[PDB]
Design a protein around this ligand. Structure first.
Ligand SMILES: *[C@@H]1O[C@H](CO)[C@@H](O[C@@H]2O[C@H](CO)[C@@H](O)[C@H](O)[C@H]2NC(C)=O)[C@H](O)[C@H]1NC(C)=O
Ligand SMILES: *[C@@H]1O[C@H](CO)[C@@H](O[C@@H]2O[C@H](CO)[C@@H](O)[C@H](O)[C@H]2NC(C)=O)[C@H](O)[C@H]1NC(C)=O
Ligand SMILES: *[C@@H]1O[C@H](CO)[C@@H](O[C@@H]2O[C@H](CO)[C@@H](O)[C@H](O)[C@H]2NC(C)=O)[C@H](O)[C@H]1NC(C)=O
Ligand SMILES: *[C@@H]1O[C@H](CO)[C@@H](O[C@@H]2O[C@H](CO)[C@@H](O)[C@H](O)[C@H]2NC(C)=O)[C@H](O)[C@H]1NC(C)=O
Ligand SMILES: *[C@@H]1O[C@H](CO)[C@@H](O[C@@H]2O[C@H](CO)[C@@H](O)[C@H](O)[C@H]2NC(C)=O)[C@H](O)[C@H]1NC(C)=O
Ligand SMILES: *[C@@H]1O[C@H](CO)[C@@H](O[C@@H]2O[C@H](CO)[C@@H](O)[C@H](O)[C@H]2NC(C)=O)[C@H](O)[C@H]1NC(C)=O
Ligand SMILES: *[C@@H]1O[C@H](CO)[C@@H](O)[C@H](O)[C@H]1NC(C)=O
Ligand SMILES: *[C@@H]1O[C@H](CO)[C@@H](O)[C@H](O)[C@H]1NC(C)=O
Ligand SMILES: *[C@@H]1O[C@H](CO)[C@@H](O)[C@H](O)[C@H]1NC(C)=O
Ligand SMILES: *[C@@H]1O[C@H](CO)[C@@H](O)[C@H](O)[C@H]1NC(C)=O
Ligand SMILES: *[C@@H]1O[C@H](CO)[C@@H](O)[C@H](O)[C@H]1NC(C)=O
Ligand SMILES: *[C@@H]1O[C@H](CO)[C@@H](O)[C@H](O)[C@H]1NC(C)=O
Lengths: 203, 87, 50, 220, 149
C-alpha cells in the first residue's frame, strides 16, 4: 500500500472510463436507452425527439468526462514537473533544499522505473547518537577574540576543542582553526582559553 | 462530537497518534477488544535542554534511504464522440 | 407556502404586512402563522452522510 | 496618467570601483499563503429534487451524473486535510520553549503562544485570526482544529528557536540562539564575528522589526 | 416541466463543482508552495533569491491563520554603503595574489581585503590571499605590499 499514489491514479482513470461507458445505458428521459429501439418503433418526427434526448445526454456525459480528464491531466502535469525537477536536482546533482528529497541531509538519489510513474530512492545523512557540550561564541587569548574558522568551540568539561558542526570530531584549537576579530571586551559569553600556535615549538 | 454522532466507539481521555480520522480533532482506533474514540495526539512531547551555553553535537550518524513515489503520466486514452454518442 | 422541515417558535419580528421571511440565499426561514399572528422559524430536517 | 514603473536610478559603474555595505538592518516581511478552503459538500439528489419522489425518479434517468458530482466534491473536501497536514505537520515531535526565554536579547513574545489565553496563540496569530472572517448542502469540519494547528506551529517555532534547522533533518539538537544566528549570518556570506560584535544591535533591530508586523497587520 | 428543472439544476450544480474543482487545484498549488516554504525557510536556510522575502534569508517563523499560513521572513538587508576602488589582484613580487575570500579595496591611500557583504578591512597578508600566475597576465592588477606573518 506504500506504492499507493500510482495505484490510485490508475484506478481513478479506469473508474472514470467505466463511468463514461455505463452512461450509454441511461435514457436521459428518452423512451429507450437503446438507439435502435427508438428508430425502429417511432415514426421519424417522433424518433427525432427521443434521439435528441439521447444525444444531449450522451454529449453532456462525454463533455463531463473530458473536463474531468482535462483537470486531472493538469494534476498529473504538476506531478510530472515535480518529478522532473527532483530528478534533475537530486539525481543529476546534490540538493541543498531541506526535505525536498527525503528527510535528513541529502547525499544522493537513484531513480527507479515504475508503471505510469517514477520512484526515487533518496539517500540521506541523518545524525544519530549525540551529546551536550559547553559552548562559547569566541575564545579570549592575548586580549583578542578568536572565532572558529569553520566549526564550533566546545568543552568536554575540562578542555576546549574546535569541532565541526555536524559531527563530533574535536580538534585542538590552534591559530589555523580560528580567526581573530576585535578584542575580548565586546563578545558576550567569551571564555578564556589558550590558542595553540604551531610555529612556536618550531621557532 | 462535532463531526457527528458516533455510535459503537468508546470515548477515552487517552490521546494517541491518529489512525482512522473522524474530524474536529477526533480519531478512532481498535484497541486490544473494542473501537475507541479519542482526541488525536500531534506527536510526543520533547523539550530540548536549551541553555545559553549548551550545544548538542552528534557523535554518530546513519544512512537512511527513503522511497518517494510520484506519478508521471496517466492513461493515454481517447474516445471518438461520433461513435460513442451514436453508433 | 410549502416545504418540509421543523417548525419552532422564535424571537423574530416581522412587520404587520409580512407573511414570511427569506434569507440571503432566497431560502424561506420563517413563517407567520395564518391564524395565530406569531412567527415560527423553519429549520431543515437533520441530514448527513453515514 | 501614464504610470511610472519606478524611480530612475542609474548605477555609478566604473571598471575599478566597487560599493561595499558598511551597515545593515534586519527586515521582517510577512508572506501570506492559502492552504485550505471550506470542506463544502452538497448532495446532488437533495439539491435538485429535495424530498420529491416524482423528481427523484426522473433524476435516476441521468444515471451516474449525481454520483460523479458527489464524488468530485468528496475528493475536494478530502484533499483539504491533506493540504493542511502537508503544510503544518512537518514535525514529528512537539517541541516547547524553556520557562526562561533568554535568547540573547532576541524577543519572540509576539511569535510564541500566549499561555494566559483559552486558545494558545501568539499575539500575532491572535491578530491574524481576528482580521480575516439547508438545500442539501453541508459543511464538514477539518481534521485539525485551530488548536491543533496552533500546536504544530508552536512546535515548529520552538524547534527553530532552540534547535535551529537540525530538528528538521534528524534529532533536535539544542544550540544557543545567538549562536544559531551567527551560523545563519555565516550562511549568507557574512562572517560570524559580525553578529557577535553587533549582537545588541541585531537583537534590537529584530525586536523592532517584529513589533512592526503586528502593527502593519492591524492597520492595513 | 420537472425534467426541465432537473436539467437546469443539474447543469448549475455541474458548473459549481467544476469551478470548485478548478479552484481546488489553485489552493492545492498554494498549499504545496506553503509546504515548500516551510520546509526550506523554517526548517532550513534558503539560498533561493526572493523565495522567502527580499534580502538575504536568515530565518523564518510560521504563524497560523484561518485557512492558511503566514510566514514572517527575517532577512539581512545591506544598509548604507561606500565607494571604494578595487582590483582583481595584487602584485607583490612578480606574483599575482588573489583574495581567498572577499575583495581587494582601497580607501584612496591603502589597500585592504574585506568581505563582500559588510565593510570590515583586513590587512592584506599571505594568509588572506593565494597566488596564481605572475603579474603580467591579470587586467587591472595593482602594486601593493602583502604582509608575511
Ligand atoms: C577532555 O579531553 C581530554 C583529552 O583531550 C581528556 O584528557 C585525557 O584523558 C585521558 C583518559 O581518558 C588521559 O589518559 C590523558 O592523558 C588525558 N590528557 C590530558 C591532556 O589531560 C579529559 O579527561 C577530557 N575531560 C572530560 C571531562 O572528559
Ligand atoms: C579572562 O582573563 C582576563 C585576564 O587575562 C580577565 O581580565 C580581568 O577582568 C577583571 C574584571 O574587569 C579585572 O578587574 C582584572 O584586572 C582583569 N585582569 C587583568 C590581568 O587585566 C577576564 O575577566 C577573564 N574573562 C573570563 C570570562 O574569565
Ligand atoms: C518582550 O517584548 C514585549 C513587548 O512586545 C515586552 O512586554 C512589555 O513590557 C513592558 C515593560 O517593560 C510593558 O509596559 C508592556 O505593556 C509590555 N507589552 C506587552 C505586549 O506585554 C516583554 O517584557 C519583552 N520581554 C523581555 C524579556 O524583555
Ligand atoms: C548602523 O545602523 C543602526 C540603525 O539601523 C545604528 O543604530 C542607531 O543609531 C542611532 C544614532 O545615530 C540611534 O538613535 C538609534 O537608536 C540606533 N538604533 C539601534 C537599533 O540601535 C548604528 O549606530 C549604525 N552603525 C554604524 C557603524 O553606522
Ligand atoms: C585609509 O586607512 C588608513 C588606516 O588603515 C588611514 O591611515 C591612518 O589614519 C589615522 C588617522 O585617522 C592615523 O592615526 C593612522 O596612524 C594612519 N595609519 C597609517 C598606516 O597611515 C588612511 O588615512 C586612510 N586613507 C584615507 C584616504 O582615508
Ligand atoms: C609594479 O612594479 C614593477 C616593478 O617590480 C613595475 O615594473 C616596471 O615597469 C616599467 C614600465 O613599463 C619598466 O620600465 C620597468 O623596467 C619595470 N621594472 C621591472 C623590474 O621589470 C610595474 O610597472 C609596477 N606596476 C604598476 C601598476 O605600477
Ligand atoms: C542534555 O542535558 C540534559 C540535562 O540538562 C539531559 O537530560 C539530556 O539528555 C542531554 N542531551 C544529550 C544528547 O545527552
Ligand atoms: C547564561 O545564563 C546565566 C544565568 O543562568 C548568566 O549568569 C550568564 O552570564 C549567561 N551567559 C550568557 C553568555 O548570556
Ligand atoms: C474523562 O474526562 C471527563 C471530562 O471531559 C471526566 O468527566 C471523566 O471523569 C474522565 N474519565 C476518566 C476515566 O478520567
Ligand atoms: C381565528 O379564530 C380563533 C378562535 O377560534 C382566534 O383565537 C384567532 O385569533 C383568529 N385568528 C384570526 C387571524 O382571526
Ligand atoms: C559613488 O560615486 C557616485 C559619483 O560617481 C555618487 O553618485 C554615488 O552616490 C557614490 N556612492 C556612494 C555610496 O558614496
Ligand atoms: C579602466 O579604464 C581606463 C580607461 O578609461 C584604463 O586606463 C584602466 O586601466 C582600466 N582599469 C581596469 C581595472 O580595467
Amino acid at each position: 500500500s506504500a506504492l499507493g499514489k500510482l495505484q490510485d491514479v490508475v484506478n481513478q482513470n479506469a473508474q472514470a472510463l467505466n463511468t463514461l461507458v455505463k452512461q450509454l445505458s441511461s435514457n436521459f428521459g428518452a423512451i429507450s436507452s437503446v438507439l435502435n429501439d427508438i428508430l425502429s418503433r417511432l415514426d421519424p418526427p417522433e424518433a427525432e425527439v427521443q434521439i435528441d434526448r439521447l444525444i444531449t445526454g450522451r454529449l453532456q456525459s462525454l463533455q463531463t468526462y473530458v473536463t474531468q480528464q482535462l483537470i486531472r491531466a493538469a494534476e498529473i502535469r504538476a506531478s510530472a514537473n515535480l518529478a522532473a525537477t527532483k530528478m534533475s536536482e537530486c539525481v543529476l546533482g546534490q540538493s541543498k533544499r531541506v526535505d525536498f528529497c527525503g528527510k535528513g541531509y541529502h547525499l544522493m538519489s537513484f531513480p527507479q522505473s515504475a508503471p505510469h510513474g517514477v520512484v526515487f530512492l533518496h539517500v540521506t545523512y541523518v545524525p544519530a547518537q549525540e551529546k551536550n557540550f559547553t559552548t562559547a561564541p569566541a575564545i579570549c587569548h592575548d586580549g583578542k577574540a578568536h572565532f572558529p574558522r569553520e566549526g564550533v568551540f566546545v568543552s568536554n568539561g575540562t578542555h576546549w576543542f574546535v569541532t565541526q558542526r555536524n559531527f563530533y570530531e574535536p580538534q585542538i584549537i590552534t591559530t589555523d582553526n580560528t580567526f581573530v576579530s576585535g578584542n575580548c571586551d565586546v563578545v558576550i559569553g567569551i571564555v578564556n582559553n589558550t590558542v595553540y600556535d604551531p610555529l612556536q615549538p618550531e621557532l | 462530537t462535532r463531526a457527528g454522532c458516533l455510535i459503537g466507539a468508546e470515548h477515552v481521555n487517552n490521546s494517541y497518534e491518529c489512525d482512522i480520522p473522524i474530524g474536529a480533532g477526533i480519531c478512532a482506533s481498535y484497541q486490544t477488544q473494542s473501537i475507541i474514540a479519542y482526541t488525536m495526539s500531534l506527536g510526543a512531547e520533547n523539550s530540548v535542554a536549551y541553555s545559553n551555553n549548551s550545544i548538542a553535537i552528534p557523535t554518530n550518524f546513519t544512512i537512511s534511504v527513503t522511497t518517494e513515489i510520484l506519478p508521471v503520466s496517466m492513461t493515454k486514452t481517447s474516445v471518438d464522440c461520433t461513435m460513442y454518442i451514436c453508433g | 407556502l410549502t416545504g418540509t422541515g421543523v417548525l419552532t417558535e422564535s424571537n423574530k419580528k416581522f412587520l404587520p404586512f409580512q407573511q414570511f421571511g427569506r434569507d440571503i440565499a432566497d431560502t424561506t426561514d420563517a413563517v407567520r402563522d395564518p391564524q395565530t399572528l406569531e412567527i415560527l422559524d423553519i429549520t431543515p430536517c437533520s441530514f448527513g452522510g453515514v | 496618467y501614464t504610470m511610472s514603473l519606478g524611480a530612475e536610478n542609474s548605477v555609478a559603474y566604473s571598471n575599478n570601483s566597487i560599493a561595499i555595505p558598511t551597515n545593515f538592518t534586519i527586515s521582517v516581511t510577512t508572506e501570506i499563503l492559502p492552504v485550505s478552503m471550506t470542506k463544502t459538500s452538497v448532495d446532488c439528489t437533495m439539491y435538485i429534487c429535495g424530498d420529491s419522489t416524482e423528481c427523484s425518479n426522473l433524476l435516476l434517468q441521468y444515471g451516474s451524473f449525481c454520483t460523479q458530482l458527489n464524488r468530485a466534491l468528496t475528493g475536494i473536501a478530502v484533499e483539504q486535510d491533506k493540504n493542511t497536514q502537508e503544510v503544518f505537520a512537518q514535525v514529528k515531535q512537539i517541541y516547547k520553549t524553556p520557562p526562561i526565554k533568554d535568547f540573547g536579547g532576541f524577543n519572540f513574545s509576539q511569535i510564541l503562544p500566549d499561555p494566559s489565553k483559552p486558545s494558545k496563540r501568539s499575539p500575532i496569530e491572535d491578530l491574524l485570526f481576528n482580521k480575516v472572517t439547508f438545500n442539501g448542502l453541508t459543511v464538514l469540519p477539518p481534521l485539525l482544529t485551530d488548536e491543533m494547528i496552533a500546536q504544530y506551529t508552536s512546535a515548529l517555532l520552538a524547534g527553530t528557536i532552540t534547535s535551529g534547522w537540525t530538528f528538521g533533518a534528524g534529532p533536535a539538537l539544542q544550540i544557543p540562539f545567538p549562536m544559531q544566528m551567527a551560523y545563519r549570518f555565516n550562511g549568507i556570506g557574512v562572517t560570524q564575528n559580525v553578529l557577535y560584535e553587533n549582537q545588541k544591535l541585531i537583537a534590537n533591530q529584530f525586536n523592532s522589526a517584529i513589533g512592526k508586523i503586528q502593527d502593519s497587520l492591524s492597520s492595513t
